[PDB]
Amino acid sequence: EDMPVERILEAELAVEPNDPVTNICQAADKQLFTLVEWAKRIPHFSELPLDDQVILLRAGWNELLIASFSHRSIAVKDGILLATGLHVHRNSAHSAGVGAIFDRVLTELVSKMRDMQMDKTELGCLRAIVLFNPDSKGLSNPAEVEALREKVYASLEAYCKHKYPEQPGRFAKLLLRLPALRSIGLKCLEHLFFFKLIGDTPIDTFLMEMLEAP
Amino acid sequence: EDMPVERILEAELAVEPNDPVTNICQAADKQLFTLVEWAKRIPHFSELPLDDQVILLRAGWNELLIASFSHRSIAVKDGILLATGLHVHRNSAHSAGVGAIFDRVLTELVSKMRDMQMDKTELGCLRAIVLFNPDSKGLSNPAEVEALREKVYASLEAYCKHKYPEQPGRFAKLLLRLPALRSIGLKCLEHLFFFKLIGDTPIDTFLMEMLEAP
Amino acid sequence: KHKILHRLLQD
Amino acid sequence: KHKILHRLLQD
Ligand SMILES: CC(=C/C=C/C(C)=C/C(=O)O)/C=C1\CCCCc2ccccc21
Ligand SMILES: CC(=C/C=C/C(C)=C/C(=O)O)/C=C1\CCCCc2ccccc21
């Protein structure tokens, strides 16, 4: 209740209108600023105590961004579209040493989003659910964050069973990409931690801050 | 269609009536045999080509077993119940060096399963969905495996919206533990790979086979 | 590979 | 810690 899909969609439309790995890290730092503004546009998110807002964003920033550039890449042939406006083809990513993860992104996320034609409203609700992760360690009131998560998918299901009546399994099919997003979110994080360790691959301040402790 | 929740429940009832880490690895090897019999009891699972049956089990054995001992541990105070009949208390697991993961199991899985009172029929359908992972690499017909996954949660939702009419968000709440199960499934796997590397901690043949390549 | 798994699935 | 994140959230 009090979690309209319209406010969520607006949040999605409001924020978004040589080494392939470097370009990706730069695009990630860039989007981290936009991610905060986005979250602020999510209903009741700003009513949470600052500390809890920090925990939620630091907990899902990686999954929230991977989902976004994937959906944006639905029109791309064999690759993804970066916020910076650059394309990263599968062959290019492969020649950089991150072909395994890249393929998982195209196969488990991009392709699947394209086949069911996930709309922006559906994307938004999914990211909102990811944002409202009640399992986040440190939350001063997990039950509260839990309450918001349920309100989000309550609106999403209503949206689906109203926009796509012919597809009664669309709602479940949307939630069934979260496990893959969690898995891919974790692998990507491993890569970032390795890149930081090695030294090569420039990492900006905000992206760098996210790789802090915990 | 042709995926009754009764067959699934029966499958769950049919299979199940000093170092804490060692006892856990032994219990894992033990359950791996029971897992196969279980799967065979899952509708249409045996109609898939042997090679695909191998891929599906090797892909989800870890999540399928973690979910099962967690649900079984719902009655436990602060710990889990092993198939072997042994209890592993949180303090004990902590003193073994696996306290971080153990806590995540009690907090994100056991506790959450206890609060909503997930029933065996719900547990079964969830594991069935995990078993039918269409993202598994190597599948000769992913679309087919995909079809079965949808039939499973189609029956589960019907079951829920018939057994717990007062809780319209129960279905989604069940699927919303998969991301956590995927995450916890991966961390546990890391531990097993480390234990094998180090040398200590005896690992039986079947458990050992699962840690093969890929 | 997967010697045991195959045997248990065939039986 | 989380210097930048806090600033962007407060503004
Ligand atoms: C964690 C991450 C944030 C994505 C940022 C973007 C791209 C934002 C935007 O441009 O929309 C994803 C990464 C960066 C770490 C290396 C592994 C990796 C491999 C293939 C594709 C992406 C990634
Ligand atoms: C992967 C795994 C299979 C579980 C097997 C059982 C327990 C089966 C049953 O007795 O029902 C889970 C493990 C084993 C690896 C070490 C990390 C770990 C830490 C805490 C709890 C469990 C685990």
Measure the CA–CA gap between B199 and B210, rounded to whole angstroms.
17
Length of chain B: 214
Residues A139/A52, Cβ–Cβ less than 8 Å: yes
Q: Which atom of ligand 1 is nearest to the CA of A21?
A: 16
Measure the CA–CA gap between B158 and A8, rounded to whole angstroms.
28
Resolution (A): 2.4
| Token pair belonging to B42 | 């899952």
Q: Identify the bridge partners of residue B80 per DSSP, sorted by sequence position.
A: B88
Q: Which atom of ligand 1 is nearest to the CA of A189?
A: 1
Q: Which of B40, B209, B213 sits opposite C5 (nearest CB)?
A: B209
Strands (E), chain A: 79-81, 87-89
Q: Is B101 in the pocket of ligand 2 (CB under 6 A)?
A: yes
Instruction: Give the CA diameter of chain A.
Output: 52
Measure the CA–CA gap between A105 and A185, rounded to whole angstroms.
10
DSSP B106: I
A175–B176: do the CB atoms touch at under 8 Å?
Answer: yes
Give A51 to chain D, closest Cα distance, Å: 8
DSSP B45: G
DSSP B108: I
Q: Write down the experimental method used for this entry.
A: X-ray
Ligand 2 pocket test, pick from B188, B196, B203 with the greatest ligand atom count within 8 Å of Cβ, gives B188
Chains in touch with A (3+ beta-carbon pairs under 8 Å) read B, D
Q: Which of B107, B171, B175 sits opposite A176 (nearest CB)?
A: B175
Q: Identify the bridge partners of residue B79 per DSSP, sorted by sequence position.
A: B89
DSSP string, A102-152: HHHIIIIIIHHHHHTT--HHHHHHHHHHHHS-TT-TT-S-HHHHHHHHHHH
Chain A neighbors of D9, CB-CB under 8 A = 36, 40, 50, 53-54
Q: Is B128 in the pocket of ligand 2 (CB under 6 A)?
A: no
Total H helices, total E strands in chain D: 1, 0
Measure the CA–CA gap between A156 and A137, rounded to whole angstroms.
26
Q: Is A31 in the pocket of ligand 1 (CB under 6 A)?
A: yes
Instruction: Give the CA diameter of chain B.
Output: 52
Which residue of D lies nearest to A206 if distances are taken between CA atoms?
D4
Measure the CA–CA gap between B113 and B50, rounded to whole angstroms.
33
| Token pair belonging to A74 | 């639905």
Chain A neighbors of D4, CB-CB under 8 A = 205-206, 209
Q: Where are chain A's structural domains?
A: 1-214
Measure the CA–CA gap between D7 and B206, rounded to whole angstroms.
53
Give B33 to chain C, closest Cα distance, Å: 8
Residues on chain A bordering chain D, Cβ-to-Cβ distance under 8 angstroms? 33, 36, 40, 50, 53-54, 57-58, 205-206, 209, 212-213
Helix axes of D3-10 and A20-40: crossing angle, nearest 10 degrees: 40
Residues A102/A195, Cβ–Cβ less than 8 Å: no
Amino acid at the residue A61: W
Which residue of B lies nearest to A109 if distances are taken between CA atoms?
B135
Q: What separation in Å is there between the alpha carbon of A135 and the centre of ligand 1?
A: 24
* Domain B1-214, architecture per CATH: Orthogonal Bundle (1.10)
Chains in touch with D (3+ beta-carbon pairs under 8 Å) read A
